């Protein structure tokens, strides 16, 4: 269909002016990784960029960063024309020059720093007019090239004399400035980022179609998550990047006004925004306006929760407006806000995980120029519990520490503090570890939901259980119509039972990982909390959170916990049923047909579990998890030692021999007991620094087995008795 | 709509309200629809202020103000009935009360077919199984499903070229079709974000589904059918039809199936109160919920109201030794109360089921209550054949595997133990078919590997115990 045009799409690399083509296009465009290519754009303008070769991209989507797009005036999902330019011709000092307000308090010589490092080792091709952006010294300043000695475009060479100027030509009115947040400023919430963009792509990008079609596009979207997880960030990025007019209501501003000065700004906020359409109204802190409940007193509060309901109703789909509202927990707001036609969509931004806390950290230091040893992987490992704002606060406190150890050491403080001096400034690992030492996990801790990092590589033995579990969890999600051929419902429960420390937890996490599914762990103390606190209404919030995190594995560990707290060898006079397990029964059997929520219980006392859990439509598959065998006891010892260094001198299958049986936990005990005797040696020294066989022999002096061969027979009994 | 009326300031509110009727009584015959009547009229303890209580007033007296020279009908939408001020229901204000209810599988089909009449779909999607997995969806959930289906398919195509012009072409959307892989992607979303509360619909289980129990099938029809069909015959002998039944027997013998089968043969609504729901009221010490259960049967009448595991609270107290108390307890007490205090005959027929007739409290038994005990035994190989077939009347079973020999080897199993064998076999099959090919039907050796795991959950002890409760009672 005249394959010249191509779509624009996001790109992974940090560098500017690099487009990443789909590899089965090579000889079509005929141009390799050494050829720069001209790209057509809106208001009659272009750019030229060197090309990279990668597998994962789609065929039709060019991958390029924000700066190369803004000048093109392409917004993601737009199409550009890609035509080669082998005809490239080098320049002699293209003239480059500072812009915006960015251009903040800088002074002196910014060219040996904000240019010369960047142009070097590069040959970065530059067409006159590009905004190409540089970063250093806790700031991103971009230099627009106003003049190119040859034209239109030029490679840069190390041999072009370089022109010191530094004058502040103000940015033109019509371009929308770069400092503003795009999608690449959002680190760690991306699964849901596709979700919001999917909802809003067609309404915001294509106003014509919904006037040319019968259908209803989403009227309002409810972003919810703990505070500081980037909900405002998301709304702004989506608005800024689709180009739609972003209006911002925040609850306390509306609540700041007097009665009737309030709802006027409110009903003006939409009657102002529906002009500028397509537009996004972001109502963050929707709890401030709209907790319509028992708890509000007064008419004027109840008035404002009203009229918000009827501005939601008032948009007739001739409004191109999308309404986003940020909330913290969903029960927070008035339930009539969720009527269909007000806030129909509900999207949970959630706490970022270790794998996500990395990207956030890497977004909030892109201007710093760090120090070489800090790896941001273990920085991202001990920041657990931090939302993305906690993370932004960490690295800014890191950078204010390092500015405390240096610089004003001399007291160089002048009118405008020097450029080259902050670029020298670097922040080492001893700053960040000092940044964490502060209170910063002052944000929320509630039930986590993320894909665990335990692959099957971590579980010694249990081969048959590993394949049994895959069938249970995998085959239904992958191959449904096969289940439909025999008219079968996949069983959605499992109950692991066996002695303690045999890996019932590991297996559950391992299988969530193999599915790349979310894993919610409800541990024993949390069920006991509901049972003492007589609050089993919490079990509903647990399953609805699995439903929103689906596909997920929901794991009840120590499901016998409440049965124990009642005794159970003699125990109370009652039956097996109790408050909390009752609500687990209720919420299980009353759950949605298949949302890919798979329920795993685990127990070390299958004896005293109530049998109602067992009935079909519940945890329906009992899987015994035995004490390991020396076959497995070898892989248990290795999967523990696959991190810490273990010299060849100490040998395994002989340790795994001497134990008639231990738990996989008793073996980790031995391992960790040995590794303690080692570090004891290494800290002391020197006044050698690795593990040794005799470390493990002193460890084995304390090896105890927690399972007494009595109850294995008891466990052996529950096995054959049940079938 | 309530929030519009609640949006105005005091006195600008009730003016629009008393204008809403004084405007509508001109145009008569007319319908005033007050939806979100909870916004105006939750007159209760909970309202604070005079102005809210003012507006719940004056609505009461606009209801009074229509003299039947008003041709106006006033409809008001509400969510649960206890929602509104009880003086709105005085006779002469809102006398009629009609429950729209969640649609069922058979109804969710028509809704789906209404919200795609303009789409021009794709050939494989049948809307029957689309309508099968949409359970829990209200009709608006359904409208949202199919619109998200149609916005998906517009995402896979069309703007593929970016044909976007002033007015987007006619012939191009007509080519556009939405396949089953769109709808199954439409369900994968959160959409059952609407309510789930006790369902009420006609079950799909006909007697064709129940192997055996021939005598029980005819006994139940008399109990439930003859009264509704032939009342004056009951009036000739001055008899009250017994409105209860108590099924008792071992587990998995079909006490639930029979209750659903008979609601279907009557084409009556079937409300199922299961064991966990009675335990909830007993732990939660909220047995005021039992009233809402029977009033919902009364509004769904003619209905079958089925209490499964009516021994559940007795078990949770033990009952071999158990607590020091008697058989009575909070929740079953309110079931007694709401039963005997129910309307003469609204065609609400009460079925309890229990696997422990031993520890049931005897007060349930007294005439005017679940008055007819019906024993539901372990099936016989006669019936164990029809149990095996009624399970396999969906999934394909080759002739090669034979039934009455499987139904032979079991001295006794439950009808549930047999479904266990069946489903265990069908799992071993799909295991084979998913793998292949790197043949695709059931086989006899599938069932032989299944039978390795066949266990019977009823131990021949308690059948004698069940046999005992039978002759002891009469
Ligand atoms: N996922 C994220 N990626 C990058 N930055 C984030 C992320 N989440 C939060 N932040 C940072 O946290 C700060 C607070 O964000 P904000 O959106 O105001 O919080 P909330 O989510 O409560 O609305 C923002 O300045 C943003 O830079
Ligand atoms: N079979 C095993 N293979 C590897 N590690 C194990 C095994 N069993 C136990 N462990 C180690 O012991 C710890 C406790 O095991 P856990 O998963 O809690 O088992 P359970 O839930 O059965 O007590 C885990 O951290 C795990 O690393
Ligand atoms: N007599 C029977 N005929 C056909 N199917 C049966 C029979 N008994 C049990 N089943 C199957 O076993 C399942 C459980 O039976 P259920 O109705 O719960 O009996 P109960 O209430 O007595 O436990 C049902 O889904 C049903 O399909």
Topology record:
This is part of a larger assembly, with two copies of chain A.
Chain A: E1 5-9, E2 18-22, E3 37-41, E4 45-54, E5 61-63, H1 66-72, E6 79-84, E7 95-98, H2 111-114, H3 116-119, E8 126-127, E9 133-136, E10 139-147, E11 153-154, H4 192-205, H5 207-212, E12 220-224, H6 231-242, E13 245-248, H7 251-256, H8 262-273, E14 279-282, H9 286-289, H10 299-305, H11 309-312, E15 322-327, E16 345-348, H12 354-364, H13 388-405, H14 419-424, H15 429-436, H16 463-478, H17 480-485, E17 493-497, H18 504-515, E18 518-522, H19 524-532, H20 538-548, E19 552-556, H21 561-565, H22 579-589, E20 597-603, E21 622-624, H23 630-641, H24 655-658, H25 664-684, H26 693-700, H27 709-722
One adenosine-5'-diphosphate (ADP) binds at residues 210-213, 251-257, 353, 379, 387, 390, 415-416, 419 of chain B.
PDB class: hydrolase
Keywords: hydrolase, single-particle, P97, AAA atpase
Entry title: Cryo-EM structure of human p97 bound to ADP
Detailed description of the structure:
- The structure is cut from a larger assembly and holds 2 copies of chain A.
- By secondary structure, chain A is of the alpha/beta class.
- Chain A has 6 domains: 88 residues, Barwin-like endoglucanases, CATH 2.40.40.20; 83 residues, Roll (Vcp-like ATPase, Chain A, domain 2), CATH 3.10.330.10; 172 residues, P-loop containing nucleotide triphosphate hydrolases (Rossmann fold, 3-Layer(aba) Sandwich); 95 residues, Helicase, Ruva Protein, domain 3; 182 residues, Rossmann fold, CATH 3.40.50.300; 79 residues, Helicase, Ruva Protein, domain 3 (Orthogonal Bundle), CATH 1.10.8.
- Helices cover 35% and strands 14% of the residues of chain A.
- The first copy, chain A, has a 6-stranded mixed sheet with strand order 2-4-3-6-1-5. A 5-stranded parallel sheet of chain A has the order 13-14-15-12-16, sandwiched between helices. The first copy, chain A, has a 5-stranded parallel sheet with strand order 18-19-20-17-21, sandwiched between helices.
- The interface between A and B is large, with 67 and 78 residues.
- The site of one adenosine-5'-diphosphate (ADP) has 18 residues of chain B, from helix 12, helix 17 and helix 19.
- One adenosine-5'-diphosphate binds next to helix 6, helix 12 and helix 13 of chain A.
- The PDB classes it as hydrolase.
- Keywords: single-particle, P97.
- The entry is titled "Cryo-EM structure of human p97 bound to ADP".
- Chains A, B are transitional endoplasmic reticulum atpase.
């Amino acid at each position: 269909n005249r394959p010249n045009r191509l779509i624009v799409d996001e790109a992974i690399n940090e560098d500017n002016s690099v487009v990443s083509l789909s590899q089965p296009k090579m000889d079509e465009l005929q141009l390799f990784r050494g050829d720069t290519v001209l790209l057509k754009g809106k208001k009659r303008r272009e750019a030229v960029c060197i090309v990279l070769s990668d597998d994962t991209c789609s065929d039709e989507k060019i991958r390029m960063n924000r700066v190369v797009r803004n000048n093109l005036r392409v917004r993601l999902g737009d199409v550009i024309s890609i035509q080669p330019c082998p005809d490239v011709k080098y320049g002699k000092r293209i003239h480059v020059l500072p812009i915006d307000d960015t251009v903040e308090g800088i002074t002196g010589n910014l060219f040996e720093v904000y240019l010369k490092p960047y142009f070097l080792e590069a040959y970065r091709p530059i067409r006159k007019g590009d905004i190409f952006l540089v970063r250093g010294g806790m700031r991103a300043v971009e230099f627009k090239v106003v003049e190119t000695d040859p034209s239109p475009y030029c490679i840069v060479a190390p041999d072009t004399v370089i022109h010191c100027e530094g004058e502040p030509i103000k940015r033109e009115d019509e371009e929308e400035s770069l400092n503003e947040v795009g999608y690449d400023d959002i680190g760690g919430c991306r699964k849901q980022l596709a979700q919001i963009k999917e909802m809003v792509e067609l309404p915001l990008r294509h106003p014509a179609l919904f006037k040319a079609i019968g259908v209803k596009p989403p009227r309002g979207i409810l972003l919810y998550g703990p505070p500081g997880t980037g909900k405002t960030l998301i709304a702004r990025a989506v608005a800024n990047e689709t180009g739609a007019f972003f209006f911002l209501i925040n609850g306390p501003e509306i609540m700041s006004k007097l009665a009737g000065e309030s709802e006027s700004n409110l009903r003006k906020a939409f009657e102002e925004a529906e002009k500028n359409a397509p537009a996004i109204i972001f109502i963050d802190e929707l709890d401030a306006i709209a907790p319509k409940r028992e708890k509000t007193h007064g008419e004027v509060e109840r008035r404002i929760v009203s009229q918000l309901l009827t501005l939601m109703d008032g948009l007739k789909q001739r409004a191109h407006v999308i309404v986003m509202a940020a909330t913290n927990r969903p029960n927070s707001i008035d339930p009539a806000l969720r009527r269909f036609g007000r806030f129909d969509r509900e999207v949970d931004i959630g706490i970022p995980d270790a794998t996500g806390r990395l990207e956030i950290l890497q977004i909030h230091t892109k201007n710093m120029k760090l120090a070489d040893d800090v790896d941001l992987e273990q920085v991202a490992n001990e920041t657990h519990g931090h939302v993305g704002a906690d993370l932004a606060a960490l690295c800014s406190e890191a950078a204010l520490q390092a500015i405390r150890k240096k610089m004003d050491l001399i007291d160089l403080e002048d009118e405008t503090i020097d450029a080259e001096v902050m670029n020298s400034l670097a922040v080492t690992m001893d700053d960040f570890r000092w940044a964490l030492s502060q209170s910063n996990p002052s944000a929320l801790r509630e039930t986590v939901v993320e894909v665990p990092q335990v692959t099957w590589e971590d579980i010694g033995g249990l081969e048959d259980v590993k394949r049994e579990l895959q069938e249970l969890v995998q085959y239904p999600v992958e191959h449904p119509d096969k289940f439909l051929k025999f008219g079968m419902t996949p069983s959605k429960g499992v109950l692991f039972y066996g002695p303690p420390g045999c890996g019932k937890t590991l297996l559950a996490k391992a299988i969530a990982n193999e599915c790349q599914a979310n894993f919610i762990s409800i541990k024993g103390p949390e069920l006991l909390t509901m049972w003492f606190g007589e609050s089993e209404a919490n079990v509903r919030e647990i399953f609805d959170k699995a439903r929103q995190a689906a596909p997920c594995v929901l794991f009840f560990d120590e499901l016998d916990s409440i049965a124990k707290a009642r005794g159970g060898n003699i125990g109370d006079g009652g039956g097996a049923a109790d408050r909390v397990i009752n609500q687990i029964l209720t919420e299980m059997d009353g759950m949605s047909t298949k949302k890919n929520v798979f329920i795993i219980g685990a127990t070390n006392r299958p004896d005293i579990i109530d049998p109602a859990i067992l009935r079909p439509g519940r945890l329906d598959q009992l899987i015994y998890i035995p004490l390991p065998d020396e076959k497995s006891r070898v892989a248990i010892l290795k999967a523990n030692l696959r991190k810490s260094p273990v010299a060849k001198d100490v040998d395994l299958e002989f340790l795994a021999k001497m134990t008639n049986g231990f738990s996989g936990a008793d073996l980790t005990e031995i391992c960790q007991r040995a590794c303690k005797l080692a570090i004891r040696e290494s800290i002391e020294s020197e006044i050698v620094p690795e593990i040794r066989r005799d470390h493990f022999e002193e460890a084995m002096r304390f090896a105890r087995r927690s399972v007494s061969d009595n109850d294995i027979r008891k466990y052996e009994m529950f096995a054959q008795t049940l079938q």
